[PDB]
Amino acid sequence: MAFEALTGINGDLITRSWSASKQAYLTERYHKEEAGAVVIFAFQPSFSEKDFFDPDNKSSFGEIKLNRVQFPCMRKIGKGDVATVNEAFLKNLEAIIDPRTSFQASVEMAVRSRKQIVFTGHSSGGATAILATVWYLEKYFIRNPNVYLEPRCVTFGAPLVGDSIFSHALGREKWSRFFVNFVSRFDIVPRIMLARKASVEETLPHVLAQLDPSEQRITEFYTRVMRDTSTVANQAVCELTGSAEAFLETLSSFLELSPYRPAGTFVFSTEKRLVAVNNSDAILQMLFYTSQASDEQEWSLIPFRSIRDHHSYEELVQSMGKKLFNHLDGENSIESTLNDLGVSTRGRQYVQAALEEEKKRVENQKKIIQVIEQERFLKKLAWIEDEYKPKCQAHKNGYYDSFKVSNEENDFKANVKRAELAGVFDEVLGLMKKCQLPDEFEGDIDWIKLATRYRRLVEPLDIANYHRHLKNEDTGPYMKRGRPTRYIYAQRGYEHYILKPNGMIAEDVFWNKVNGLNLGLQLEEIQETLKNSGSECGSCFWAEVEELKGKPYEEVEVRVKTLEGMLGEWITDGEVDDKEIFLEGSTFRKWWITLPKNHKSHSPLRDYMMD
C-alpha cells in the first residue's frame, strides 16, 4: 500500500514486530525471533522511575551527551556538538551490548546470514530499540553500506530518546527513513520525557505501575506532564519561526525546557485514520495538540484514556489494514486530517508553521544551488585556477607570495574575487547556523566537492591576507583566533565524508599518524605542543609555516617534523600543491634552506630543495 511505499515496512513485519515486543516482556533484556529471512530483536520494557530517570544523574531531564567514539556520527559535523540522549535508556542499551551477553554475537550471526535486521520494542523497550538501531548503524551499515545491511526500527509508544542534534544527525545521514514510531493519540508515554524530573517525581511510580501490563494521582500526573509539554511546544514553535528573539533570549535564562525531540517517522493512530509525519517539529506540535480535550466530558475522560491507550497497540496492529492512511508532509490540505485527529485551529496554525519552515529550508537550498551554479561564480574559481596560479608560478615565487607581497592588478582582482567568494560562503554558513537549510546539506556530495575545492584554492589566499595586514602581531596565531568558521566547517564536512566509512574520527587519525611518525617526545608534551597547530589541515599549511619561520629550531623541532610527515600525504591528496611550495621565491623554501644541515640531511625532503 502507500504505507509500505512511504515507510518501507509492510503489515507482516509490523505484526511480527508487535508479537516479538509482546514476548519481550518475559525474556531478560532482549528476545531474538526468527521468521524466514527476517530476524527481530525485541527489547524488554521496564516500568520503574530508575529506568526513565537515572538516580545518579543530577539533571532535571536525565540526559547525557553521547560519546563521540561509541556513536561517532551523532553530532553536528560543522559545529562539533555531540548529541544528547536519556541516560537510563543508554545504560540499559550498554548493559544489553556488553560482550558478557549474546546480543552482539547474535547480531553478527544475523548480519552474516543476509537477514533483515529489525529492532522492535514497546514503551521503554522501544526507546532501547531506537538506540540499538543507531548502534547498528554506527557499527555495521556505515562500514559497508549495502541494501541488505539496512535495518528497520519499529517502536510502539516509545518515549523520546534524543535531543534535536540526535534527529538532525539521523536526517543528515539519511537514516531517519529506517525508524517508525507508532503512537496512539492519547498515549502519555511519548510525551512523558517532555516534563521535568521535579514535576513528576512524586507521582511517577504510581503511574508507571499503572502502565505495567488513585485517580487524583493519575490526573495530577497528566496535568503536570501536559503543562510542561505545552511550555515546550510553545517555545519550540516560537523559536523556529524566529519570532521574538530578544524576549525568548531573556526568558531562556528563567526557562528549564526539555531537550528531547521526535526522531524518525511517527504514525499517529486513531480509530479510523493513520497519519504519518516525518517532520520532527510537526510531530512535537502534534504531540501537544492531539491530546487536548474538546469539552468537559472528554476532559473528565482523558486521564483514563491516556493510560488505556498505552495498551491499545494490539488492536492497532490488528486493525491497521482497514484504516485510511495519509501522509501529512506530502498532502497540502492538512486541514481535514488534523481536524479528524482533534487538533484545534491554533494548533493547526503551529503545525502548518512547522511544515512551512521545512519548505523554506528546501527553497533556501535551491537558491544556494542556483547561486553556486551561476557561471559568474564558477568563473572566479576557474580564474584563480587557470590564470592566477600559472602566472604566479611562472614568476618563480608562487601565488601565496605574490598575493602577500606584490601589488599587480592581477593580485588586486584575486583579492576582490577572494572577498566575493568569502561573502557567498559566509552567507551559506549563516544559513546553516540558523538551521535554515535541510538536514542533509552538510552531507551533500556536490556541496562537499565545491566547498573543498574553494577551501583548497582560496584558504592560502586568506592566510596571505591575514599575514599581509599583520594580524598575527595583534590578533594572535591564525590557527588559534583568526581562522574563518566556514573553512573549519568545510574541512570537517570533507573529513567526515571521507573517514566515516572507516569509523574513525579525524583527530584520532591525526594522532595515530603523528604517533606513527615516532617523534623524539612522548605523548603528553607532543599533545601539548601540537595545540592549535596548522598540521591538522592541509589547506592551513602556510599558516603553520608562518608560525615556524621566526622561531629557533629546538623550540619548533617537533612541529617541523610533524609538518614534514604530513607533507607527503598532503601532496598526494591534492590538499597542498607541489608546483607552488618548492619554487625559488617561495617563502617555505627560503625558510627551509635556513634549517640546520643535520635536519636538512635527515629530512625526507632533500630531493626537492637545493641550498
Binding site: A198, T223, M226, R227, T229, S230, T231, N234, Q235, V237, C238, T241, S243, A244, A246, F247, L248, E249, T250, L251, S253, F254, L255, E256, F288, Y289, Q292, A293, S294, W299, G342, V343, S344, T345, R346, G347, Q349, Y350, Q352, A353, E356, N407, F412, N415, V416, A419, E420, G423, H469, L470, E473
Partner: protein, 512 residues
Amino acid sequence: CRFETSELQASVMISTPLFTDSWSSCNTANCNGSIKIHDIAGITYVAIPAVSMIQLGNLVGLPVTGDVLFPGLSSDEPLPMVDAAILKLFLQLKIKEGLELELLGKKLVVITGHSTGGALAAFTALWLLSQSSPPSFRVFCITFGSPLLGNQSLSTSISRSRLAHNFCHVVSIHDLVPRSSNEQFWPFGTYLFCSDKGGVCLDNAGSVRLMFNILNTTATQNTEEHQRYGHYVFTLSHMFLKSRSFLGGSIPDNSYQAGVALAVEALGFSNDDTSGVLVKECIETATRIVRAPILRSAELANELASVLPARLEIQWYKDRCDASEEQLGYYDFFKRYSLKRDFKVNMSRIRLAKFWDTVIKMVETNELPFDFHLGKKWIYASQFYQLLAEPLDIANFYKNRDIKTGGHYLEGNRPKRYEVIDKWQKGVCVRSRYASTTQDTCFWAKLEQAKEWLDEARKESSDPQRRSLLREKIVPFESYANTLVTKKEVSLDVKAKNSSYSVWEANLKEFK
C-alpha cells in the same frame, strides 16, 4: 506580513512557571501587606505589595544626586522623568538597603507586584538593570495592572538601551488603571493584554498606546476587574488542557490573516464589530512596525556587501602609493595630482561616501533597530571605512577649496557621517610596529591647519606677539604629532620623505 506572533508570544509567557509563581508571590505580599522575598524552583521572587496612596500623576526627573542613581537612563535629551510618588515610596520603603543585601548570592531574580506594587517593582527592576555595571543576577519584571510609570522620553531611553524585554506588564482589557493615566505618561516593555479567552503581547509603545485608546473608546468599565487578576491568571494558566478553536466564523485561508483573526478573538472581540476591526488594524500595524527595521537592516547589509570592492580599491591605492618610488603617501598622491589610479580611487571614494551617508541618515531617522550600531559587524565596517577613506575626503575638500574662504575641515566642514562613526566607535600598550593606518583620522586636516598657521606666522615678521601666539597654537599640534608617531599609531605613509608632513616638519624646524 507572513506569521502572527502577538498571540504566540503571549502563550509562551502564560505557559511558564514564572506567570503563576509571580502571581502567587503578589497574592502573598498583598495578604501580608509588606515586601516579600521568596524562592521557588531556584528562582527568587521579590513581591512588592499594593500600597495605598493619594497622589499619582505628577512627573519628576530622575535624581542625579542620591543613593538611588540611574547611569543607564540619562542619555535621552528630555531628562527621563518618573512618577514622583513612586520614587518617594521607593525611598520610604528603603528597598535599596533591604534588597541589595538580601539578594546577594541569588542568580535568577523576578520582581513582581499588583497595582501600585507593580509600578514600584518596575521602578526597582529599572534601578537594578540601570546601574553602571550589570548586576550579579539576571532580573525580570512582571507587573499586574500597574499604572504607567514615566514619560515618553523614559520609554525611548529604555527601548534604546535594550531593557524593554526585561519587563512584562499583564493588563486586563477591563482594568481601567493603566488606561487612565495622564496623556504625558507612556508605556514601556512588553504588554500582555488578556481576557477570559486568551492573551496578546504588544512590544511597541505607540501600538500599546493605540490599544489603550481603542479600549477606552469601545470596551466596558468596571473596578472589580482589577481584583479579577487572580481569576485571570488561573484561567489563563489552564488553557493547555482545552482545545481552543476559532469559534464563530471561518478563518481566512491566508496564514497571516488567520493568525490576526485568532489574536483578535483571543482579546475577546468579534471580527465583525468596530472594536474588532480597530484591534485587528492595531495588531497588523504593530507587526508591520516591528518588521520594518529588520528588513531595512538586511537590505543595508546586502548593500554593504555590494560595496566592499570599493574599500578594496582604496586599500590597493594605498598599497601602490606607499609602494611607489616618489614616497608621497596616498593623501598627497590623491590631493596633488589626478591620474587614472586617482580617478578610479575617486570613483570608489564617491561610492563609499554615498553609501555611508545613506546608512548614517537611516540610523539617525530611526528606520533601523536600536541595537544596530552596537552590533560589532557595523562597528568594524565603519571603523575600516573611516580609517581608509577619511584622509581621502580631507584631500578632496582641500583640493576643491578656496584658500581663504574655504576655511578648514573640522571647523564645521566635516561630514556628519564621520562624526556619527566617531560616536559609534567611542561607544564600544605601545605598538611594536607602525599601525596599518593612521589612528588619528583627522591628522591631515590638522596638518593643513598648521600649514596655514605657519604660513601666517612667516607671513609677518614685524608682529612678534602674533608670532608668539601662533607658536602657542602650533606647539600643541606638534606635540600631538610626536605623541602619535612615538606610539607608532600612524601608517608609514605619514613618514614618507616627500609626504607633506615631512616638508612641513622641515619648514617648521628651519622656522625656529
